[PDB]
């Protein structure tokens, strides 16, 4: 906004903003017992099995 005092005039301005993303990583470990993995493939035998 210009005005009538002795101040210098104002040229038009321009601004440029540089923004970037950030990487993040997430991870958890599950253990599974070897017999639990195996007897999912073992055959049905008896009503206790």
């Amino acid at each position: 906004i210009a005005h009538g005092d002795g101040r210098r005039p104002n040229k038009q301005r321009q601004y440029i903003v540089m923004k970037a993303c950030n990487k993040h990583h997430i991870g958890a470990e599950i253990e599974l017992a070897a017999a639990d993995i195996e007897l999912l493939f073992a055959e049905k035998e008896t009503p206790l099995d």
Binding site: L32, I37, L40, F41, E43
Partner: protein, 80 residues
């Protein structure tokens, strides 16, 4: 009584060393479908279940030790 023998049809043919990867060239690129245990990154879902990963657990490494059979005097090896 052959049901007992049908058990040994299951267990012996189920427990073998994995055979050699040999596919004739006239079949084509079917051999790439016969490579499953080298695949080591299985896909996951929102709610994964065993039925989604029962194929994932099926590939397991090949581990079989070699035993030793010793016939010992009962005096040297303490019985318990």
């Amino acid at each position: 009584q052959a049901e007992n023998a049908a058990r040994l049809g299951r267990q012996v043919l189920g427990l073998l060393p994995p055979p050699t990867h040999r596919v004739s060239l006239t079949r084509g690129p079917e051999f790439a479908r016969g490579v499953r245990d080298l695949l080591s990154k299985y896909a996951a879902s929102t709610r994964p279940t065993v039925g989604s990963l029962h194929e994932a657990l099926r590939q397991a490494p090949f581990r079989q030790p070699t035993y030793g059979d010793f016939l010992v005097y009962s005096q040297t090896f303490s019985p318990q």
